[PDB]
Amino acid sequence: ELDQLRQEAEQLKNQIRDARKACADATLSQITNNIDPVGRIQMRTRRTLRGHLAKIYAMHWGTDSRLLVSASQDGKLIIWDSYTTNKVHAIPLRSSWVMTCAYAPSGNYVACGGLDNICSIYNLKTREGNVRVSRELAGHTGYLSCCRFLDDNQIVTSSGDTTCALWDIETGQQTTTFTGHTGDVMSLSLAPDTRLFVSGACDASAKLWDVREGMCRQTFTGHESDINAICFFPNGNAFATGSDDATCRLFDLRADQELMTYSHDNIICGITSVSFSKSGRLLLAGYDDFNCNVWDALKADRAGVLAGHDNRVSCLGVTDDGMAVATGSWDSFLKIWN
Amino acid sequence: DQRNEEKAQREANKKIEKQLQKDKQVYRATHRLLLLGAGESGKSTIVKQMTGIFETKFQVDKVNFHMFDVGGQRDERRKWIQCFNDVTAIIFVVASSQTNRLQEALNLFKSIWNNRWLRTISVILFLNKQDLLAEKVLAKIEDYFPEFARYTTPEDATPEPGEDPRVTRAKYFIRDEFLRISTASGDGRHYCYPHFTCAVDTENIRRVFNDCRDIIQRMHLRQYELL
C-alpha cells in the first residue's frame, strides 16, 4: 500500500518538476538587463526609540504610517508614535515570552502571542480609557510564530504546530484550519487583496493558502534551510522569502517557480525579516550580522546597507505609504530610516 | 491649538515612563533560568520540591529567581530555544542509564553548547537520579560506553564517605563525558557547572544560587576587561 502511494507521489512530483522546467523561459536577471540599476542607496537613521528592556522580536506599522507596535521578550507591548518618538501605550503582557505582534487595519485592536500558545488581542480604543484584553484565543499546540489581521473581526495565525488557522474574534473559535506543513510555520504575510496568504515553514517550503476555501493552492521548494521571513510583492502576484541558507528568493504565483535568488558569497548568515517597498523595486532584508541589506528586486544587486544596530535585527517593516523603514533588533532599539 | 494634544501625549508619555522605570528595577532584580531536560528526568520533582510554558518562582537569600519549564512544545527545539539567549543559566537535568538515553542527553547538551546563540550562556548540569545510579552500579555501563573500561577515577574526586569506588567511577565518567563536550568545544565565554543531585535534595536551590553568582561575577569581570 505505502510503496504504491509513494511511487504515485514520486510520479506526480516528476510531472510537476517537468512542467516547472517547461515554463522556464528565462531568468529574471536576463530580462532585466534593459533596466537601469538603482545605484547606491544611503539610508540613514532618523529616529531611535528607547524604553524596551529586553530583546525585541516583532513590530508592525499601522495603517496611518505613524503608530508602531513593538513586542519584546520583557513582557511589554509598547505603541510608538514614530513622528514624535513618544510612547502612546504600554500594555503589560501575561507571558513575558512574545514572538509576534500585529496592528489591526482599522487601528482598534492589537494582537500578540508567543510560547504561551495563546494569542492575546488588546482593544486600544476602550471606554474605560485603559488597555484591556478583548479576548484570548487558544487551541494551538505550539508557539505562535506569526499573526496578522484580515479585518477588525478576523485574524489569521501561524504556530509551530506545522499548521495555520483563521480565528473569528467574536466567537473565539477556529473558522478554518490550514494543514499540510511538516515543519514549524515561522512567518506569515497577507496578500494585498486580503484573499490569499502565503506561509513559510521550517522545511525549506512555502505554501500559498486561500482564506475562504481553506486549502493550499501552490507549493514552492526552492530553498535549502528553514524559512524565517516571507512578504508579498505589492501587486500581489509575487512574494519574497528568507531562510537560514543566506539566500533571498522571489517567487511568482503565476509562474510557480523561483524567479530570482539573491545571494552573496560574503554572507554566511540567515535572513531574519523581509519586506518590499511601495513600488516593489527594493527588497529589504535583515541578517544575523547586525545589519540589513537592501537588494535590487530586479537586478539582484545590493543597493545599500543599514548598519546602525549592535545586535540581531529580529523584525523589519515599511509603511503602507513607503515613507520610512522601521527595523527592530535584539538590542532593544527601534531604528527608523529615511 | 496643537499644544493641547502635545500636552496630553506628553502626560501619557510621562505616566508610561514612570511605570516602565518601576518595572525596570523588578526586571533587573530577577534572575531568569531555563529548566531543560528529558521527560524521564527529575525536573518535575525538582520544581515540585522547589499554557505551553510553566513557571516556578522562588527566592534564596532575598534574591529573585525565575525558572521557566517548557512542557507544551513539540520535539523540535531549534527555534523557540532562540528566545532564551539572555537567561542567566540553563539548568540541564540528566538521568542515569533502560536504553542509552545518556547519549541523547549528551547530543542535546552538545547542541545547546554549540549553537551560535546561547553560546554566551552558562549551563548548570544536574546529574539527577543519583540513588538509582548507585542501585544499578552496585547491582553494564561499559556496554553503552566502551570507553568506561579504560577510564580511571579522577585524582581530584571527592566522593561522599562510604561510597562504593565503582559508583564514584561511574559518577565521574558521566560527568567527564559532559565536561569533555563542554571543554573540547566552545571557548571561555561560558562554563559548565556539574552537580550530583536527587529528588530529595534541598541543596539544589543553594547550588543554583552559587552558580548564578559565579556566572554574574564572571560577566562583570568581562565587562571590566579583567577577563
Epitope: 506545522t162 511538516t182 515543519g183 521550517c202 522545511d203 525549506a204 521548494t221 535549502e224 534551510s225 528553514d226 537560514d244 541558507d245 543566506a246 554566511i268 540567515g270 | 513539540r74 520535539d75 523540535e76 527545539r77 531549534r78 530555544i81 541523547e104 547530543n107 542535546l108 552538545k110 547542541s111 554549540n114 549553537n115 551560535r116 568545544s185
Partner: nanobody, 126 residues
Amino acid sequence: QVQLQESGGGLVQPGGSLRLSCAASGFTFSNYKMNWVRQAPGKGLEWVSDISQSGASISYTGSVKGRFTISRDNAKNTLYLQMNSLKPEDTAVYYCARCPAPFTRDCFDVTSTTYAYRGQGTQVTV
C-alpha cells in the same frame, strides 16, 4: 526539492557485513553536516554517527564505536556508512539525516520525529 534517499539493506547474517549510502539532491552538500539515525522496532529514533563538512571530525555511539565507519564524498554528493560485525540488536530502519542549517556545528533536531530533512530510510535485518 530537497530529498534524501538511502540504498542497501536487507537480511545480513550475524557478524556479517553490509554497506549503506545516501544520495543527496537539492542542496549544497559541501556546506552541511550530516548524521545517521536508526529506529529499531518498538523503540524511538537513535543517533548513530555524524561527519562534518570536511570530514576531519567524526563520532559514533558506544555500541557503534569501532564497528561502523562513516565517510562522505562532496564531489558525488553522497553519504557513506560501512557496516561490519553486525549483531541482532542492529536491526532497524536507517535514515539519512541532514543538519538544519549550514556553516554551524549544532545539529539540534535530526533525531526528532517528523523531521523535514531525512530520507525514507532502508530496512536492515540481522
